[PDB]
Amino acid sequence: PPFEYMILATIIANCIVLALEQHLPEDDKTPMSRRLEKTEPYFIGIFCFEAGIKIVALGNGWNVMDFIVVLSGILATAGLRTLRAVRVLRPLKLVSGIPSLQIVLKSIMKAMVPLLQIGLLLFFAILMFAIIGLEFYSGKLHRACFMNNSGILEGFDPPHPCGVQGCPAGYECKDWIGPNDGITQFDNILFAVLTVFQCITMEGWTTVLYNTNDALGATWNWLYFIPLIIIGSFFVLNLVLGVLSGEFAKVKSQVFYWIVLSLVALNTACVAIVHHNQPQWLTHLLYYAEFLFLGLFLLEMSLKFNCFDFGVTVGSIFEVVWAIFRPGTSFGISVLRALRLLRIFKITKYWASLRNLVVSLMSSMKSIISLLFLLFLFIVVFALLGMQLFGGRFNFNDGTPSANFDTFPAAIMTVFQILTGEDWNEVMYNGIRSQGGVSSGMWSAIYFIVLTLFGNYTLLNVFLAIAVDNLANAQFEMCILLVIAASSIALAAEDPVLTNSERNKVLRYFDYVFTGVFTFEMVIKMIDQGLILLWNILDFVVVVGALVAFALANRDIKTIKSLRVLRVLRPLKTIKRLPKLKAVFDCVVTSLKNVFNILIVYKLFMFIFAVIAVQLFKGKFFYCTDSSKDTEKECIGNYVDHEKNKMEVKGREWKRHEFHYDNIIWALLTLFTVSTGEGWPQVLQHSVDVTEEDRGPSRSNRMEMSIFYVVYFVVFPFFFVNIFVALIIITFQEQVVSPSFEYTIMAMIALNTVVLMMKYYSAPCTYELALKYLNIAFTMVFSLECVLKVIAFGFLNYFRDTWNIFDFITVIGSITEIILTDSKLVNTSGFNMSFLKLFRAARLIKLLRQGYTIRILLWTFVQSFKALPYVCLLIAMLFFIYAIIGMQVFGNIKLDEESHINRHNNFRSFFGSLMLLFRSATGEAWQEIMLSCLGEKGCEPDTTAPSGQNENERCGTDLAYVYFVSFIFFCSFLMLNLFVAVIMDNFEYLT
Amino acid sequence: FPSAVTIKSWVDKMQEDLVTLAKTASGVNQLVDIYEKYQDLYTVEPNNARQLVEIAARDIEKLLSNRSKALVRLALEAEKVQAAHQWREDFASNEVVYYNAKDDEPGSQRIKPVFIEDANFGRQISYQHAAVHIPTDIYEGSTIVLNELNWTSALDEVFKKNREEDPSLLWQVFGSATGLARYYPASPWVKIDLYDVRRRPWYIQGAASPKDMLILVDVSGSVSGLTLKLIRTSVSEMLETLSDDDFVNVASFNSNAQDVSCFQHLVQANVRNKKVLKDAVNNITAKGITDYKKGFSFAFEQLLNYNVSRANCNKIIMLFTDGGEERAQEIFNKYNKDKKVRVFTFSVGQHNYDRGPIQWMACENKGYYYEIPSIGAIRINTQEYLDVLGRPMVLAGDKAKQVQWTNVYLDALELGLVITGTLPVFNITGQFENKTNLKNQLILGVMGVDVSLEDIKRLTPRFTLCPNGYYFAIDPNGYVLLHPNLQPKPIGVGIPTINSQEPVTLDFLDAELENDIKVEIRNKMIDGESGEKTFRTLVKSQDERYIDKGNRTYTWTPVNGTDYSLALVLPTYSFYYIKAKLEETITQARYSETLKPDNFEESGYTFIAPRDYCNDLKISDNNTEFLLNFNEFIDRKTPNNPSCNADLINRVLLDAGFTNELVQNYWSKQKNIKGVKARFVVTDGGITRVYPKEAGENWQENPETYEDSFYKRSLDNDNYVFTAPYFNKSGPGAYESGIMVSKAVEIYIQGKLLKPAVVGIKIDVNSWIENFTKRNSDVMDCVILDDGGFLLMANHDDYTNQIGRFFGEIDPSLMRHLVNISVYAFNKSYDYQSVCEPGAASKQSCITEQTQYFFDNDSKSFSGVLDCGNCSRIFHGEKLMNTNLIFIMVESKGTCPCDTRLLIQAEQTSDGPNPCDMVKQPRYRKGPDVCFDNNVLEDYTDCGGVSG
Ligand SMILES: *[C@@H]1O[C@H](CO)[C@@H](O[C@@H]2O[C@H](CO)[C@@H](O[C@@H]3O[C@H](CO)[C@@H](O[C@@H]4O[C@H](CO)[C@@H](O)[C@H](O)[C@H]4NC(C)=O)[C@H](O)[C@H]3NC(C)=O)[C@H](O)[C@H]2NC(C)=O)[C@H](O)[C@H]1NC(C)=O
Ligand SMILES: *[C@@H]1O[C@H](CO)[C@@H](O[C@@H]2O[C@H](CO)[C@@H](O)[C@H](O)[C@H]2NC(C)=O)[C@H](O)[C@H]1NC(C)=O
Ligand SMILES: *[C@@H]1O[C@H](CO)[C@@H](O)[C@H](O)[C@H]1NC(C)=O
Ligand SMILES: [Ca+2]
Ligand SMILES: [Ca+2]
């Protein structure tokens, strides 16, 4: 019957109505929202009517949902927590309307059985670091130095905690609410779990590390935070993709063709030369050439990826005609004709390879059309829930944020941003603040935690669906080696600032003898091999560069420094010496060769998107320092600045946003930064506000520009990125004894863990006494159990098991901690013993695995570091090399606030450089760091080497672009290779 | 309890002793005898009040006429110069030469002036050119500012010509509508400089006619957050542009329209009402659903009241919203069918709501549309409606060119209290052929000229009349142009809690004690008419401690040039004054010889009055070097006095001769008296002589005779007057000075009463207390009080330590009972110009409640019993004859264990009077009779959004 289609149309109309209304703060309603409320009974009338029709003949979980919805609806109009089960959940009944989406939903929910079990480990690993950080960071983040002396407030825009460090410029610190308005701190177990979880997703973890860095000291906090990123997120992300694959496993002339192929190579060059402030004659030339190309393409269409070249060529005529009658914005569709660059492979061979690639691509793309729609329905439901929860509540005294839930497009944009996982902590802070603050609004973090968990469950199932389809489309050496290590070590112990200091004084001669040994190896190898009769050329160029640097060492301030960078290649020659590292390098190179074909089409699509974005935005990203001025002519002079409640006089400057689309190269860089995922909400905010070619931006001028970023995020990161890992995997298949005592000890340690997770700040004194007494009782019980085990099992044979040895180690450490905790005259405030708390916080390390949690894991249960974890040595070498290069190049930049090169993050020291590189690899503000490490920057003062010049030359180079881009590209590629190597490790187990 | 007759006899003995000692020591009778025995070195002349008031009014009118002539010349020349301009688009080849102030660039070249030091200005000035002030937000070098500088450079010639015509001319300034101000003479500008010439009160008063502004604030839910505080700041800044001739009210609406404050109708928009409205607006919350119809109907109803006093002029509605879809066309088609009310609308905050209906209703009712997206735009967008309001004024033509005078305000360039003339300047370009009429509906700017209050004070001499007499001029609003109680400080309002913009508007009824006769006189003066009234009133002394009753004669007349009204207050015994007639140099030399400081041991320490005797004599505020300068000048300058007025000199030398001969003939006979510590005489000439030269360093009195509180107190009273010393070690003299007494010298020349001087002594406290004993009696204490309830001494020798203290601050019960039985009367006032210590939540200025006590009845004996609870307090009270002292005896307070709240008569900070009910019965005032609105020729086809 057609009675079902009428219900479907009604559901569509109700979804459209729900997508129309907006929420205003403080019981305010727009006049349009009154009309929508008028048609509440009409929509629910037939939803209650359909229940009666289906109840007189039927007497599944979807009918339950519809009944719940209608029951909540009828009770909602009698008068409000009940107006959420009938509104935000109503679009979900579209799934029950049709059986296709019902079958699709059953395909993705049947793959979560191995995923829910392994996700329990992530919660249990989060519980570890929550307890560990609770005993070390509790209540130690409540002192930030303001000292206004006039308004007893202010200070630093990011508040700087004192702890035991002391604010350098002076000041003193009274009570402080907390780092992120008192939300991101380890006060109790619930706060610690949220802080650990929000930094296991690599969002704001650096801010958390730095907040505890200047409150306790920069010595041991890295030991807590680096493993939390490595063993917390790197392993879990690897584990979920590993276990998800576990279920997956088991005209006709050639001359005319050449002419038309070369002709389309000029259409792309004509749209790739468009740039801001181009000459007017260039504009006229391109205006003529566009019409000429369109006419020629239409003529050859009349004469004659045939379908792709059909709509694209025809679309240009419509685009030119439609825009002619409306002078203004020009979206651009002509560059879509560039897809014919794929049909050029037959000339350069590998044509069949591109055919297989493109066939797999279109086959995989479609295989997700139903899952993508099912994905979008959940996005709509979550956006509606956020509107019902945070709608009209983000109107703060400082202005409403760009990521709000006031209107349906805004809520959709915010939900999409949180799903991409970028800056979701900021939106969660805003929601917590809106719902009341830390005192009463912490219940709204559940919405963002649940939504974030679905963002990973989103890409996981989409990646799984790609791989399933992709199979269907498949048919004296030691001494010379040690002298390299000594030279590499000597490369790291330098001061980039103090060019003439004792360390450099004693290191120049060390470098001289290293070069002497290297040239001895040079000279001894020119007789055995007879020159020429490969990386030996690399060794030769390194040695000749060293010789040249020595030659013109004895002008010498900037020219000679570039030659000294060549010595950072000393760790590279270790690859040839080690056969075990040579194999890993060979595997990396062959993996790059195997996947290089997809990189070509990826680059082509990136070029197309950048060309589209150049015409879409171009010179619209300019702005003036004060919002009043809208053009460069008026943006001149001085203006009064009311920012941050402080009145000041500043000069007006016509500036440009850091990341823009003026050139093709600038657009490519911006798109790459967006693809990495960092800073893309800011780019979207800048792009939405564009007004005209040479005018200042106006907020939310055109919100339709977010469609570009939605399509870009659907295509490039969500689809092309996991095509690499999927196709690499495709080319991969072919290569004491009593029961009561045992029960009590297992149950007793459960109580100790519970006792462990109840310490909290500002607890009553009697609470602390009870906690201490419980700890003492548990320690005594453990000592009694250990002495019983020793008596009944023999002292020497007691340590015959690793678990028993570990348990005995903690018990002795527990006794030592208990005795020394109270102490008396041996307080020794200097000798503050704290590391023995690790045994108390690791008792659960043994309490775990009641069954087989490890076995539940795949990479952890099966041999992890069998042989493939040898690739980890290659990543360490890359980090070392880039840290050395950064120290040598950017190591002398002057540190300042209001920039991403400062005391917390800089290149001054080797370990600071490694921390910066790790932060960039995880990805926090690597684009901002690259911006800070640019040319004409301040220079750190050189007390040594006295001279009459102060400014001399400006430190900071313009090679930061290539440096950072290449670094993160190499890091991502090596991470992908590490993942496929772990797949190597567990190949036998999964079969 | 002693008998009444015995106490009366004891009091009679004490008062007889005190009076006899004062009479025989001060030597008043000798001074009277000598004054009546000479009668030849001076003549008595009348002080006819009517002629004096007429002369002063004519002088003030002439001064304001000079200022009006200068203003007219400047305005006409500016109009003519601007009519012939070319509007060059480039100034790189033809640089503009001008001096920019506040400097320590392409398109223009600076000027380096000499900056000589010149009198009548406290700063460095240059007469060679005119300075230019450009506000921070406005950039010099743009086309508008460069064209303005080029066409306004022609005003320097007129500035110089005006200066040469009247050398006693203060700042002349032309305030451009562009934003820059060009003033002459050139002088450097005074943290962040927020000055803007378009917000100054004189510019606001010259830009447009008075208005009837009514502010509508949308307080629906959608305005909560940043836009709410933006709206609050915008409303405060908009209120800051309103003067005392405008009437304003603030309303809010969210599905219901109501007033944000206690006013309920249009109010006078003075400082108090403006502060009340600001405090009410800063405490509103956003909640509900907008309803434009209700709010607009409420505003239109409040603009059509006419029950209360209004301006009967520009009626404007300020709508502060964010956006919406409702247009409320029916409301506008109902109330203002003929469009008699302009509607100005503002869109505040960053939002994306529909601005269509807002713009439509803005520029359909002859109004304008403005946008305030941030804090920076608040200051500029809240002053631009005066361009719209001024279109009928410019369209009127020559009729709308009248010099207007502002309220007394502190000068922006640190010159003191000044008033400013004002004349608008019209864009007349294209009027030769009468074809443009498109940008000629805006004023070019406003011309202004400053008049210092010292110039007006110079035209009303006060040294020919007694210190109790004075002049004062009044406003049509009732404020005082000049008055003895007007001070160069801002008037306070509210309480100064901490966690030069406003004028000094002091009403006549707040300058001195209010009365029904005072109100009638003020009303008769405001509307403008001659008159004269003599009556009996109570006047407050200079120190806020005493109130005295005296007969006054008020003579007033209007100044014909302007709307001011001038009155002269003149008591009895002051219609005739002493004028010295003498021209022989021998007498002048023999009178001036007794003034050198070295000749003080045999004549007594002599003070001088820092009066303006002539230009070459500088006032130093030292009185140790001023006297030396004065007598050196009189021994050096020729007696003919070519440039030194001889009336003051002759008076001071005659009075010096009289005082010296009195000291030599009488005081030198008795070198020391056991009961007298110092003997002083203060005269109308301006000299105070203290017989004991030593006593000199203890004389903490103003050298000027006309500023001595005891002098006026003794002038008013017939009998002797006792002055209570200060308290809490306000200086030396608690025990080393004594109790001051005084007595006015009455003189009869030909049966005509004259009071030229006062004499008195400083009675030693020890001798008087010893005579009082003839001590530490715990059964009873006997005290002596004066007019004001101030202690002189007691019998416990513990009240004696707290000398000169209010009797209620130590024994509140007896003081309260004395007030209750109507032996003392008290009146409270408000001091709107008083420095206040900041409170909780430098120093600020706030209202202060002042109280004074004085004798109520003429009865002499007051006896009764105080009932303080389960105890009896028997007492008696007797007032000493021929003085201002009262002797009361009470029993010890220790017997009756009771203690009430202490009664304090001091500078009590306060916040009243409450202005919610003040506006219900406002004081009478007269508004301007000239209005400019509703011209048919007005364009009003330009909204605020079509231009954008
Ligand atoms: C007193 O009134 C007179 C007129 O009654 C007035 O003189 C007029 O001044 C304006 C400039 O402010 C002249 O405008 C010319 O015409 C247009 C309009 O400004 C300008 O062309 C561009 O116009 C756009 C907007 O339409 C503007 O954004 C842009 O800046 C303008 N300039 C460009 C693009 O270069 C012309 O440039 C401008 N002429 C020149 C030489 O710049 C009127 O022509 C003047 N009218 C007359 C009759 O002379 C005068 O300013 C008023 N006095 C004061 C103090 O303002
Ligand atoms: C406006 O600027 C112009 C150009 O600077 C002035 O015109 C010049 O004035 C000088 C001085 O009298 C003459 O010598 C030139 O011949 C004028 N014309 C030029 C330079 O082209 C003009 O005087 C200025 N307006 C006013 C009111 O000063
Ligand atoms: C200015 O006013 C005075 C009186 O105050 C008058 O005598 C004089 O004529 C006026 N004009 C000039 C130029 O002084
Ligand atoms: Ca991030
Ligand atoms: Ca609203």
Author numbering:
A (entry chain A): 89 to 147, 158 to 177, 186 to 356, 473 to 526, 540 to 710, 1155 to 1212, 1221 to 1241, 1249 to 1429, ...
B (entry chain C): 27 to 130, 139 to 224, 232 to 540, 553 to 827, 843 to 909, 970 to 1076
What does the paper say about this structure?
The R-type voltage-gated Ca2+ (Cav) channels Cav2.3, widely expressed in neuronal and neuroendocrine cells, represent potential drug targets for pain, seizures, epilepsy, and Parkinson’s disease. Voltage-gated calcium (Cav) channels permeate Ca2+ influx in response to the membrane depolarization. Cav2.3 channels, a ternary complex comprising the extracellular α2δ and the cytosolic β subunits in addition to the α1 subunit, are strongly expressed in the cortex, hippocampus, striatum, amygdala, and interpeduncular nucleus. The transmembrane regions of the α1 subunits all share the canonical voltage-gated ion channel fold, wherein four homologous repeats (designated I-IV), each containing six transmembrane helices (S1-S6), are interwoven in a domain-swapped manner.
Supporting the structural analysis, deletion of the entire CH2II helix (residues 773-791, the resulting mutant named ΔCH2) had no impact on channel activation, but shifted the V1/2 for the steady-state inactivation from −70.9 ± 0.1 mV to −57.3 ± 0.1 mV. Following our standard protocol, the structure of ΔCH2 was determined at an overall resolution of 3.1 Å out of 68,109 particles. In the absence of CH2II, the segments on the intracellular border of the membrane and in the cytosol, including the α1-interacting domain (AID), which is the elongated helix succeeding S6I, the cytosolic fragment of S6II, the III-IV linker and the carboxy-terminal domain (CTD), are barely discernible in the final map. The entire β3 subunit is completely invisible. We had expected that VSDII would exhibit an “up” conformation; however, it is clear that VSDII in ΔCH2 remains down, identical to that in the WT channel. Accompanying the rotation of S6I and S6II, the previously sealed I-II and II-III side walls of the PD now both have fenestrations in ΔCH2. Consistent with previous structural observations in Cav and Nav channels, S6II has one π-helical turn in the tightly closed WT channel, which transforms to the α conformer in the ΔCH2 structure. In the structure of ΔCH2, the S4-5II segment and its hinge with S5II undergo the most pronounced structural shift; the hinge rises towards the membrane by approximately 6 Å. A lifted hinge between S4-5II and S5II together with an unchanged VSDII result in a sharpened angle between S4II and S4-5II, which is no longer compatible with PIP2 binding.
